[PDB]
Motif scaffolding. Structure first.
Motif, mmCIF file in Angstrom:
data_model
loop_
_atom_site.group_PDB
_atom_site.id
_atom_site.type_symbol
_atom_site.label_atom_id
_atom_site.label_comp_id
_atom_site.label_asym_id
_atom_site.label_seq_id
_atom_site.Cartn_x
_atom_site.Cartn_y
_atom_site.Cartn_z
ATOM 1 N N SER A 1 0.790 -1.233 0.000
ATOM 2 C CA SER A 1 0.000 0.000 0.000
ATOM 3 C C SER A 1 0.824 1.287 0.000
ATOM 4 O O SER A 1 0.306 2.368 -0.295
ATOM 5 N N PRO B 1 0.847 1.855 -7.748
ATOM 6 C CA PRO B 1 -0.014 2.801 -8.466
ATOM 7 C C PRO B 1 0.581 3.149 -9.834
ATOM 8 O O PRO B 1 -0.140 3.468 -10.776
ATOM 9 N N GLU B 2 1.907 3.074 -9.935
ATOM 10 C CA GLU B 2 2.597 3.358 -11.188
ATOM 11 C C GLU B 2 2.322 2.262 -12.221
ATOM 12 O O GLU B 2 1.850 2.555 -13.317
ATOM 13 N N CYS C 1 -1.382 2.171 -13.173
ATOM 14 C CA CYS C 1 -1.748 3.265 -14.060
ATOM 15 C C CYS C 1 -1.290 2.987 -15.491
ATOM 16 O O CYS C 1 -1.965 3.344 -16.455
ATOM 17 N N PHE D 1 -6.309 3.246 -8.932
ATOM 18 C CA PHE D 1 -5.773 2.889 -7.637
ATOM 19 C C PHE D 1 -6.487 3.749 -6.605
ATOM 20 O O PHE D 1 -6.567 4.971 -6.748
ATOM 21 N N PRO E 1 -1.437 8.870 -6.330
ATOM 22 C CA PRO E 1 -0.794 8.415 -7.569
ATOM 23 C C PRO E 1 0.705 8.324 -7.341
ATOM 24 O O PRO E 1 1.225 9.005 -6.463
ATOM 25 N N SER E 2 1.398 7.483 -8.105
ATOM 26 C CA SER E 2 2.849 7.344 -7.942
ATOM 27 C C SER E 2 3.581 8.699 -7.962
ATOM 28 O O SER E 2 4.471 8.951 -7.135
ATOM 29 N N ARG F 1 -1.387 6.619 2.951
ATOM 30 C CA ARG F 1 -2.379 5.548 2.949
ATOM 31 C C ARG F 1 -3.399 5.725 4.061
ATOM 32 O O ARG F 1 -3.266 6.589 4.927
ATOM 33 N N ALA G 1 -11.630 8.043 -6.939
ATOM 34 C CA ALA G 1 -10.926 7.297 -7.973
ATOM 35 C C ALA G 1 -11.737 7.264 -9.273
ATOM 36 O O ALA G 1 -11.183 7.036 -10.351
#
Length: 494
Positions: free
Chosen positions: A117, A123-124, A127, A133, A137-138, A340, A364
């Protein structure tokens, strides 16, 4: 009578200003996280679609959790078996999660807390394969980096910070999220015992030697003198090799406060009050409170504002926490920003009437903050109105509804047992088989405490808790905790 429900997730996204339909969600986790994620999103699903299974869920099950028959499995809409063993083979395996997400396929992934998490590569990679996600975001996690980086950012934004190997370091700060040059970053680290002692004498002892890549009781060492600094500093290097190392003054028994952040994908970010988690037993949050009343509302609000400024700057999205350090006097210091949701989030949900996992979902799908009914109601606006909301200077500054007390508990088929109490009706809990949490609500702090003590007493009857929950009762009943004294020294000689 007007109908507020909608046909499908499809209509909801269209009618609520979203820009993406998420109706299938993969949960990369187990235990209470999995259960809580589903229970929260389904409650919302039933309110919005009059259909509890409107948003489908797919879980990952290891050979362990499957044989033990975890409640979350039969709860999910679909479950996929994954390799057992340590989480790097499953729940924490980013390449595996992304893979499963792609094949089903799901439109989004929720990781909650623990495992992957906090790994920006999730998330990268998600995506990169068109999978949403339910978290930052990353680009935002990267733009935040570790403690070294995030602290430089804190300072660049003028948020106080504890004396450390990088004190004073800042960056030159319309779009574009902040960044810390590799050269400035290297100024906060100590490469050898030479400059280590250098910085040490500047921060003063006692201090903490910490690896940036540390965590999990590793890569950390407390040094109280220059004589032991060297060995300890080399001990860290040996434990988490290659890792950047930094030093930081040791907090002298102060309060620990957190701000609950919530941001959309449009630069909007609000604070949902905070939590007080000063009571701890050997690096463990034992008793938590919401909202945080120990500090003056005027001062806590300022901490909210810096929390929001920091979040906005790194282009944060979804929910996260900004941990501070409040001192008996009046000073506070930024500690970190958890990218998180934390296990003790129900506290906030209960005092701010905000279903967080449902909020994470909607965000999201691209729904603006002002279109989330929970927030509209929080701000005293219409449930389903469309009018914009001035978060900076609202026409109805939100107010926390009551007080919540949460306690962490321990024992003397299934992975998560739901706890119910016939005694107190404003208390609910669970237990993961090890540890669990109980949440108590009250009109005021006093009432929240009484309820907890009665629920805890109701717990003592259970064999598994005929001892373990005795100290919590004593603690909650101590005159010190009752009056909410600033000093937390009394915990030791309890």
């Amino acid at each position: 009578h007007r109908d507020f429900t909608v046909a499908s997730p499809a209509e909801f996204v269209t009618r609520f200003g979203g820009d993406r339909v998420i109706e299938k969600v993969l949960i990369a986790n187990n235990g209470i996280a999995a259960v809580k994620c589903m229970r929260s999103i389904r409650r919302w699903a039933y309110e919005m679609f009059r259909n509890e299974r409107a948003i489908r869920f797919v879980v990952m099950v290891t050979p362990e959790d499957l044989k033990a028959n975890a409640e979350y499995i039969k709860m999910a809409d679909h479950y996929v078996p994954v390799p057992g063993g340590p989480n790097n083979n499953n729940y924490a395996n980013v390449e595996l999660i992304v893979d499963i997400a792609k094949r089903i396929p799901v439109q989004a992934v929720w990781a909650g807390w623990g495992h992957a998490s906090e790994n920006p590569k999730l998330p990268e990679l998600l995506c990169k394969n068109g999978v949403a996600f339910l978290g930052p975001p990353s680009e935002a996690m990267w733009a935040l980096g570790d403690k070294i980086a995030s602290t430089v950012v804190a300072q660049t934004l003028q948020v106080p910070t504890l004396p450390w190997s990088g004190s004073g370091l800042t960056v030159e700060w319309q779009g574009k999220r902040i960044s810390v040059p590799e050269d400035v970053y290297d100024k906060g680290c100590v490469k050898d015992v030479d400059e280590g002692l250098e910085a040490a004498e500047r921060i003063g002892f006692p201090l903490m030697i910490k690896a940036s890549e540390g965590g999990g009781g590793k890569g950390i060492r407390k040094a109280e003198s220059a004589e032991d600094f060297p060995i300890l500093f080399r001990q860290v290097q040996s434990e988490i090799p290659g890792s950047p190392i930094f030093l930081m003054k040791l907090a002298q028994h102060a309060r620990h406060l957190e701000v609950q952040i919530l941001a959309d994908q449009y630069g909007n970010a609000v604070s949902l009050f905070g939590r007080d988690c000063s009571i701890q037993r050997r690096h463990q949050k034992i008793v938590e409170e919401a909202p945080a009343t120990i500090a003056p509302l005027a001062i806590f609000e300022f901490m909210e504002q810096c929390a929001i400024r920091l979040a906005k700057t790194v282009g944060y999205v979804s929910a996260g926490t900004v941990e501070y350090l409040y001192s008996q006097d009046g000073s506070f210091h930024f500690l970190e920003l958890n990218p998180r949701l934390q296990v003790e989030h129900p506290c906030t949900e209960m005092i701010a009437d905000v279903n967080l996992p449902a909020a994470q979902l909607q965000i999201a799908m691209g729904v603006p903050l002002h279109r989330l009914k929970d927030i509209r109601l929080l701000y005293g606006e219409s449930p389903w109105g469309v009018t914009p909301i001035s978060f900076e200077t609202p026409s109805n500054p939100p107010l926390a509804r009551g007080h919540v007390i949460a306690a962490r508990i321990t024992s003397e088929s299934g992975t998560v047992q739901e706890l119910n109490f016939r005694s107190s009706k404003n208390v609910w809990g669970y237990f993961s088989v090890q540890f669990g949490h109980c949440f108590s609500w009250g009109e005021n702090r006093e009432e929240a405490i009484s309820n907890m003590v009665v629920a805890l007493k109701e717990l003592s009857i259970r064999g598994d808790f005929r001892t373990t929950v005795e100290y919590l009762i004593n603690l909650l009943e101590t005159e010190s905790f009752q009056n909410n004294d600033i000093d937390t020294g009394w915990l030791d000689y309890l």
